[PDB]
Amino acid sequence: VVQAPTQVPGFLGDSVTLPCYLQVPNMEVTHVSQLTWARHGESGSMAVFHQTQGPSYSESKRLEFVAARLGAELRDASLRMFGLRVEDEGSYTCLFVTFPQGSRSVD
Amino acid sequence: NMYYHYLGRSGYTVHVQCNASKFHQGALGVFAVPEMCLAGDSNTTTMHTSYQNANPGEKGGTFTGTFTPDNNQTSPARRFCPVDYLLGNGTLLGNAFVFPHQIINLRTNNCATLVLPYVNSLSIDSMVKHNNWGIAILPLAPLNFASESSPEIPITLTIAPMCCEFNGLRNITLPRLQ
Amino acid sequence: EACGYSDRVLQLTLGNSTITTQEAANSVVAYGRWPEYLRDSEANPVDQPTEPDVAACRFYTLDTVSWTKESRGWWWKLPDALRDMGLFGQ
Amino acid sequence: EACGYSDRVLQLTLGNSTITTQEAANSVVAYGRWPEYLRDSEANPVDQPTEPDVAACRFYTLDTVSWTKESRGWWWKLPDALRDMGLFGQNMYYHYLGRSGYTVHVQCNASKFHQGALGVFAVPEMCLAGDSNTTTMHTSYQNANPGEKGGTFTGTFTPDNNQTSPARRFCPVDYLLGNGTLLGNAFVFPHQIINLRTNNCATLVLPYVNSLSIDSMVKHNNWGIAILPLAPLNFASESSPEIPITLTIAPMCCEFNGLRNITLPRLQ
Amino acid sequence: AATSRDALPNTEASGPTHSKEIPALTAVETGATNPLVPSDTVQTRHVVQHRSRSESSIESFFARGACVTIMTVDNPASTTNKDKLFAVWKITYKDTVQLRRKLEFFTYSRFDMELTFVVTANFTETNNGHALNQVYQIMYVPPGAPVPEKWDDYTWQTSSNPSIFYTYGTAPARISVPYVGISNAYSHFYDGFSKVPLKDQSAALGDSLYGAASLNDFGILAVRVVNDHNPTKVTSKIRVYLKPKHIRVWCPRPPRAVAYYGPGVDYKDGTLTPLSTKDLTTY
Amino acid sequence: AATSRDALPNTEASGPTHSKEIPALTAVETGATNPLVPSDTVQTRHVVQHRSRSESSIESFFARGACVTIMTVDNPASTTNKDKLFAVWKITYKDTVQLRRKLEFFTYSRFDMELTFVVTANFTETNNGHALNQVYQIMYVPPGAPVPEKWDDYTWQTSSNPSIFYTYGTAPARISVPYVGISNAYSHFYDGFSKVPLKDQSAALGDSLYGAASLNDFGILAVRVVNDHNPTKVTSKIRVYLKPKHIRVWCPRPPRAVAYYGPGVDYKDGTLTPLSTKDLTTY
Amino acid sequence: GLPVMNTPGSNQYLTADNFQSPCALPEFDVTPPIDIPGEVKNMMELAEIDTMIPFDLSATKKNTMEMYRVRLSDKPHTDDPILCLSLSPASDPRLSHTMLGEILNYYTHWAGSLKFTFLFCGSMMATGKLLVSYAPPGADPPKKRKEAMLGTHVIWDIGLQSSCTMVVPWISNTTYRQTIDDSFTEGGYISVFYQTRIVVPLSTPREMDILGFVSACNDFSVRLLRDTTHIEQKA
Amino acid sequence: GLPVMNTPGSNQYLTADNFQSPCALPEFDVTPPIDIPGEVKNMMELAEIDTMIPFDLSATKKNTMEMYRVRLSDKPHTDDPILCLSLSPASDPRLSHTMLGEILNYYTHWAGSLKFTFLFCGSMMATGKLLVSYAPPGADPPKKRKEAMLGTHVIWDIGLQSSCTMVVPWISNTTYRQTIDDSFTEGGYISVFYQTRIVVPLSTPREMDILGFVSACNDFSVRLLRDTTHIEQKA
Amino acid sequence: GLPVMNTPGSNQYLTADNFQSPCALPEFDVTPPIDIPGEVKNMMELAEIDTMIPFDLSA
Amino acid sequence: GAQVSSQKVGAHENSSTINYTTINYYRDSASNAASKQDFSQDPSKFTEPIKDVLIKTAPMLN
Amino acid sequence: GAQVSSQKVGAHENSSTINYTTINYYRDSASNAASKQDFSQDPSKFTEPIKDVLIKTAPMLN
Amino acid sequence: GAQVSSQKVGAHENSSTINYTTINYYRDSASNAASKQDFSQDPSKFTEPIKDVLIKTAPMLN
Numbered sequence A: 001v002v003q004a005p006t007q008v009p010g011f012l013g014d015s016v017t018l019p020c021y022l023q024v025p026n027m028e029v030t031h032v033s034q035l036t037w038a039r040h041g042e043s044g045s046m047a048v049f050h051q052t053q054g055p056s057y058s059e060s061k062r063l064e065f066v067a068a069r070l071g072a073e074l075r076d077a078s079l080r081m082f083g084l085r086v087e088d089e090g091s092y093t094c095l096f097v098t099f100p101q102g103s104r105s106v107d
Numbered sequence B: 001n002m003y004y005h006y007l008g009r010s011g012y013t014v015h016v017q018c019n020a021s022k023f024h025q026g027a028l029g030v031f032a033v034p035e036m037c038l039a040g041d042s043n044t045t046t047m048h049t050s051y052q053n054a055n056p057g058e059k060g061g062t063f064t065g066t067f068t069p070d071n072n073q074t075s076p077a078r079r080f081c082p083v084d085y086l087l088g089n090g091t092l093l094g095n096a097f098v099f100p101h102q103i104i105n106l107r108t109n110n111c112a113t114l115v116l117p118y119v120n121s122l123s124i125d126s127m128v129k130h131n132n133w134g135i136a137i138l139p140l141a142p143l144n145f146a147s148e149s150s151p152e153i154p155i156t157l158t159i160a161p162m163c164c165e166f167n168g169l170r171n172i173t174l175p176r177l178q
Numbered sequence C: 001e002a003c004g005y006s007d008r009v010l011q012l013t014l015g016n017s018t019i020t021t022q023e024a025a026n027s028v029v030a031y032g033r034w035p036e037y038l039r040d041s042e043a044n045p046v047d048q049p050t051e052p053d054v055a056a057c058r059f060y061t062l063d064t065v066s067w068t069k070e071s072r073g074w075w076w077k078l079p080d081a082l083r084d085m086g087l088f089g090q
Numbered sequence D: 001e002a003c004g005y006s007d008r009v010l011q012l013t014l015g016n017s018t019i020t021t022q023e024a025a026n027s028v029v030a031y032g033r034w035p036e037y038l039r040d041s042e043a044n045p046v047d048q049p050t051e052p053d054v055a056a057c058r059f060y061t062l063d064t065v066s067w068t069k070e071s072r073g074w075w076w077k078l079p080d081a082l083r084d085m086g087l088f089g090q091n092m093y094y095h096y097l098g099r100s101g102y103t104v105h106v107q108c109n110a111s112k113f114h115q116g117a118l119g120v121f122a123v124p125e126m127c128l129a130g131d132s133n134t135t136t137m138h139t140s141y142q143n144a145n146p147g148e149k150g151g152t153f154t155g156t157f158t159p160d161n162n163q164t165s166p167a168r169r170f171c172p173v174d175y176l177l178g179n180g181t182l183l184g185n186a187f188v189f190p191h192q193i194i195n196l197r198t199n200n201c202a203t204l205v206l207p208y209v210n211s212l213s214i215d216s217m218v219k220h221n222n223w224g225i226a227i228l229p230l231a232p233l234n235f236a237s238e239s240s241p242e243i244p245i246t247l248t249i250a251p252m253c254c255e256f257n258g259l260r261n262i263t264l265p266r267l268q
Numbered sequence E, F: 001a002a003t004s005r006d007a008l009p010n011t012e013a014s015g016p017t018h019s020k021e022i023p024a025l026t027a028v029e030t031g032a033t034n035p036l037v038p039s040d041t042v043q044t045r046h047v048v049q050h051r052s053r054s055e056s057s058i059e060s061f062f063a064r065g066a067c068v069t070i071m072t073v074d075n076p077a078s079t080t081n082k083d084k085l086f087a088v089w090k091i092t093y094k095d096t097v098q099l100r101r102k103l104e105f106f107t108y109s110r111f112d113m114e115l116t117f118v119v120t121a122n123f124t125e126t127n128n129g130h131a132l133n134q135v136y137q138i139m140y141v142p143p144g145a146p147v148p149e150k151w152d153d154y155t156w157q158t159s160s161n162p163s164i165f166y167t168y169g170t171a172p173a174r175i176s177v178p179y180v181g182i183s184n185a186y187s188h189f190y191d192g193f194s195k196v197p198l199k200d201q202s203a204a205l206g207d208s209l210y211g212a213a214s215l216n217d218f219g220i221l222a223v224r225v226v227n228d229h230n231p232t233k234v235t236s237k238i239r240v241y242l243k244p245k246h247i248r249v250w251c252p253r254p255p256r257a258v259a260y261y262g263p264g265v266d267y268k269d270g271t272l273t274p275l276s277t278k279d280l281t282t283y
Numbered sequence G, H: 001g002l003p004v005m006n007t008p009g010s011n012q013y014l015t016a017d018n019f020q021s022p023c024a025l026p027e028f029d030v031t032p033p034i035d036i037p038g039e040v041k042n043m044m045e046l047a048e049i050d051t052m053i054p055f056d057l058s059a060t061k062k063n064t065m066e067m068y069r070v071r072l073s074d075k076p077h078t079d080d081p082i083l084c085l086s087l088s089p090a091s092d093p094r095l096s097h098t099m100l101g102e103i104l105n106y107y108t109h110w111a112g113s114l115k116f117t118f119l120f121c122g123s124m125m126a127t128g129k130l131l132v133s134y135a136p137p138g139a140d141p142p143k144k145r146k147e148a149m150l151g152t153h154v155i156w157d158i159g160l161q162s163s164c165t166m167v168v169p170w171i172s173n174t175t176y177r178q179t180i181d182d183s184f185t186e187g188g189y190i191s192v193f194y195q196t197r198i199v200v201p202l203s204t205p206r207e208m209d210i211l212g213f214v215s216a217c218n219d220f221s222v223r224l225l226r227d228t229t230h231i232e233q234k235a
Numbered sequence I: 001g002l003p004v005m006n007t008p009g010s011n012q013y014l015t016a017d018n019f020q021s022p023c024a025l026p027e028f029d030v031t032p033p034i035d036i037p038g039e040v041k042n043m044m045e046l047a048e049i050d051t052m053i054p055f056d057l058s059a
Numbered sequence J, K, L: 001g002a003q004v005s006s007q008k009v010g011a012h013e014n015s016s017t018i019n020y021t022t023i024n025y026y027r028d029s030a031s032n033a034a035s036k037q038d039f040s041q042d043p044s045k046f047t048e049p050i051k052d053v054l055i056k057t058a059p060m061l062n
């Protein structure tokens, strides 16, 4: 299930992180578990954190990805945007993919 | 030419050299395997073997008589654990013969010559990202000489690219090989 | 050409590279001789030659220099100038 | 022609009017279709049609507008823009039905030292977005049809907030083609670009386009003429330059049906 | 003669060039797009092309059943004070966004319409009573005909109007409809009005909606549950799938870039910024 | 010309031999297998062969519907705090072992795919309330298309994507799919990576999974129960049967000898000893 | 009655199916077609038409008439990029929303040669030579003329002919590429540079804008029809 | 509507059935085939290829590179067996996992002639004569050269020609045998012995290994397709 | 039995449909038609006949 | 009244043109399925709507 | 016994006369569907039932 | 468009070749059933991949 807490200020200067937590119940555990981030955002159709095996930077040069990747975990991944100008909002999304039902998440 | 181009395709003439003496024993099983995907060293994760370790370059790699799992979860070796009797890939060695091959039986011959064609799901591909053929050399019958308890003989491997061609020319590719 | 064609406007294409020019004073072919491969009648070294073709026979752009009231002139040597240029130098 | 002839130099002649141009980027014929009269096989209204010919099928020059660093763009609608033009407007109002093609000639000259690019577009059924966020499709007939003076585009969408007495008019935002779609793509539509360094103007020959063989010219506008600055006007060093954009248009192979008493619209 | 599924043009072997011919150079100002091909600006090899545009053809592009509306009807207990709920839907492709955006890539259109009806029912109350298999009546009421006021009034007789009597649990209902437009082609867009405001006549009288033609384009779909009131209440939903067949389209347009806001081209504040942040010199 | 179902070669009458010809003697070192037949090493009688290899042909060997996955969906009571459970499955033949092992006898493959869907439902709570016949919606979401986030969000409109509307209790759903690979043939094995680790560029960036090509090969299967929330909760299961038709295979390989461990060739400790104890000189 | 036996798929509703069905309006007098101008037979036809690229999608320029304008200047020669762009027609923010990118997002796979045409909107008195480059994947994305010059490119000379077209040839390992960001089906890099330098006389603007357009070559095609993400109905 | 009457089997799903069905992706531009090397048309083709036999499946040698090596020696002549093996291609632990045995386990019935080829991996200076035997069922399984010599056999003489092939002829009561251990469809016994004795000079290894390979003759076939036990998914 | 597969629209009742159906009264001796005057073939024929207009619809 | 046509064959089995049979049950064209036997046309009317035909090798503007 | 006829084709696809096949299963005409292949007639018997044929260009009453 | 073929007949009744009729309903090859009319090939490319063709009666190595 999806339980993202990210409603974050968010401090400018900068810099701070843009987290994404998806706590996993619990007896029907999730794969494949690639993680996608879509901005909001003139999205046609990329400024993306995607992570298949090796973390792939869809071109927004000012990014930092910190998840225990190339292996697996799965995803309570944290992103970071520096920097350092007010490349603001708008908004951001955090969508996952799953073998069971979960090719889906929440903005 | 392989590094300067995005795409590239090539065949090969593989000549494995290994001479000895009428008094030596042993049999080298020389095999040419298409898409030779090998098994990793980890039991907690999968398909995790790093680009650097999956590609030894000229010096190649080696097989192990035993599967010993990488236990360092914190800083993983991220490399292959190819077990001999399982062809390093989950299948029984005794059957590797369904694949293009030759046997170097000391009493019968000095070497093995395999002429390999460009094999693949595509007409042409990324030579740097993808390896078309795998050259596996295992001792079907163990080296043995006169009475010496610890004999030794060299195995020299000479290979030649064939009817090879390249596309998508640009600046040279500088890989992170370490 | 009443159709449009002209001495000043040219388009040169070699391998994966193309050069365009709207203000040229025609083009010159040294001693009236267009570049060519070594003929059998004139050949010396007996071994099968290496002909890179499109991999080397293309357009390399060297470091751009600056022309000023003070400049006395510039010089280059071939092949020296292209010695470090992709597959041709190799 | 080794004889002299060229793409940049043209001469257009309709009825008693002639247009000349020494700096043109050729001319465009919408969808490759040259204006034509209504064929018998495709005809609807059974009555003998009224074909003004030279009296209406000639060149009318609308009010000249001014292009500046600040300009976001201009828009017009056909036939609306020609509604008050001599014998063409008279015949349009006297008849229930009417159909017509057009030769649109947009004039805009400057100097070898000026910069800028005018994106001139001919849009079929150019439906524009309204100024209201509480209601929809509410733009009044009077405001939707500016006549000869046409309308203009805005760099920003500012909603009509006076719920009590609504402006009831359009809020066409430039980058969205005034209609919910990205300007960068307006080029899929019959057009020409007036690039100051290359040409004085834009010539578009428009055919009668529509879901019907013939329709109500007073109730419905077949074509929309949109002119936006792809690249902003700029001169030498002057901080606030200016150049005129004159728009001359000529009805073509135009014909009318259902004759009766003259239609006196409530245009204000 | 060229078929939608014919192999695209083969790439021809092209060598070096030192000529007065300038394909690469042009002038977009003229309104035209440079018909160039790889062999015009670079040295190409000979390639036998097998690829086709079969799937991208007008029919192929729309050859798919799309959901245009969800109708809600019901069958309560005789006793309930509230009326037996029967559905009345004004036929159109604008109530939903997906199919509408596709059709809107073009100004005018023409096509035979295939309507497929998926019906699903369910129990509303933490009850336990049951209900016998339901039979739905989907009646087509064209502009001018007596529109139903009661789940069981005289209009449901359908003496002239076309009605589909669907049986729950059976293969989803389906019917075909010809090109029924009063015009030579459907108008995805109407840059005008249904009325002409006459000076000499009172303002309010000559008034009408912008971009809106026939107040009643194609009439409505009136759906009900034929079965009599059942002790235990059962709510049903009718999903209407619309597919354009034998289709033709004219005058192309740029796709809808921002959130739809009503039946017209109108956009709404706060939705006008589609594109996202991305630097000029960043891959 | 030789048909898969043609009778194998007849055994020819063979007498005694005292010659310089040595069929029985050879040299496996060359890489070849001795083409010998009974009549080469022993005295044989004449036998008219009727037997055929019909059933062992590539098509015949795979001409059988195999279970590749079990999808779980549901339809709870409106009141429940937990979300209506709709299924999302990433299409593949590796979630199960049987069919995967068969396909893996070969490196590359090519074939039209036949998907058959067996749907079974049941009651979860010691309740007594009932539920009207359920209608399932199996939507195919190709890589790039908006993946559903709610059993009832805008994506289920399927304007462009292919959807199958299955009715419970009716003959198991079935559809055919062409050879959809972006390559000239499906790759049962990819000895490489989707990315090239560039020195000049940060380690983590150039990283990728071993043996893994397109992060998203063939998109996913999104299944849901179209019917609205029902007072009494009903859980359903969708079993997907995959059958490879009009199939072709290249470059043979030795069958998987030890327990599968993930989507790759990886083996796991404690499973590497397949063969059992049996003495050299014991029948 | 003729003996029949029902097979799997029976009574099912395949949104993509193609069968006959009873007509609700029998004998209906259908209104004939009129030769309406601008008729289209294939979505690819629209992809072959030049559409303006929103290159400068920066924080302040994006979603405004400005994103379309790539600004240049009479400044001194520099081997640094005027603009860097990834060959991801359907996924890359600068291409994804162009007529071509938009049609591509209704499909899962794309193939063939694209062509990028650049229009010089500066003054007639302004001269210059630019270098338009295309570098097939697998190596360090070009950040300097030196590297860019080594791959597929065109040296554009500014004059009477306002615009210059650079053809990005169909160079790929797979028969088709994915309409989404994917390491395996990656297209490479499109970059632009100053061959020499934009030169202008006195009394003339030292700064001008260049517009850029993208369209598909006749060898271009798409497949596997699908629902796009460029539009939605949250609610 | 045409009068029809539904028959038994209607609406049922036969995993092995063979019918037509609606295509989910109509008009889809399919990627053509390329002449890829190594194409197979029939599983039996793989069974005809020589595959190494795991003969020494003893407690310590099994599941290791050693199980493949049958060790011999310069020791004195003995009528005792070098190695005893049952003709149960699909069930016998030493044959069940070879390419042939593996394919056989996907089928219920097997028929035709098999051929066993033995490779002498000892030194060139080493001579010897071995007796390879095949004894059709019904009698006391051979435990001594004497008995083995009485049935189908081949006296292999070691020399230049490294290997020796013994063909096990299709000799059975039933038209087909079962891919499992079954008294009724039993194949008989395959045994190997010392005809004379492995002889070697001084300064030479008195012990060497002989490898063994099994493959199917052109008269060989299988039937009644079935699920194998050689792989599973407990969970 | 001949392999068949049911398609959408199956078992539905389209009030406007046009199919065959079993006859409840087989072999029934039908009474022939007599040349009756005033036969109509098309509703439009009636529309072509002059009909008086109720012009003065006043209170 | 049976209409026999050719299937553009994709992935061929290890098993000459293949055909498919079609028959129209209804009197109304609208009732009929989609042939998919459609035609392509040259983009000209949109990519090159200019009065004076253009030659790519020569100067667009002359 | 198959009866093949022509469909008066309305909206044609981007895809020559199109036909539809009909076959009668029952022995009784009543069981049969409606052909819709019907004929028109001239309103005369109702619009001009007068003994002396009338010429529109001339005086009705003379 | 009907495709008539021969059934390789197994157990014959106490009841000349027997045939079976096949007809393709769909436009897409993928929709079609499996013909099972497949071809065999000689194992050579795998059992004898050697450059110099080998004769079984003669010495493999010479």
Ligand SMILES: CCCCCCCCCCCCC/C=C/[C@@H](O)[C@@H](N)CO
Pocket: E091, E092, E093, E113, E115, E138, E139, E140, E162, E163, E164, E175, E177, E180, E181, E185, E186, E187, E188, E217, E218, G024
């Ligand atoms: C028993 C079911 C009968 C179904 C009756 C359906 C007949 C009505 C179909 C109308 C088709 C409308 C399609 C869309 C047209 C719009 O685009 C118009 N605004 C454009 O002209």
Ligand SMILES: CCCCCCCCCCCCC/C=C/[C@@H](O)[C@@H](N)CO
Pocket: F091, F092, F093, F113, F115, F138, F139, F140, F162, F163, F164, F175, F177, F180, F181, F185, F186, F187, F188, F217, F218, H024
């Ligand atoms: C409404 C149902 C629509 C069903 C849509 C199915 C389309 C997707 C089919 C993909 C086929 C994948 C088959 C296996 C391929 C793998 O072996 C690859 N890793 C090898 O290339």
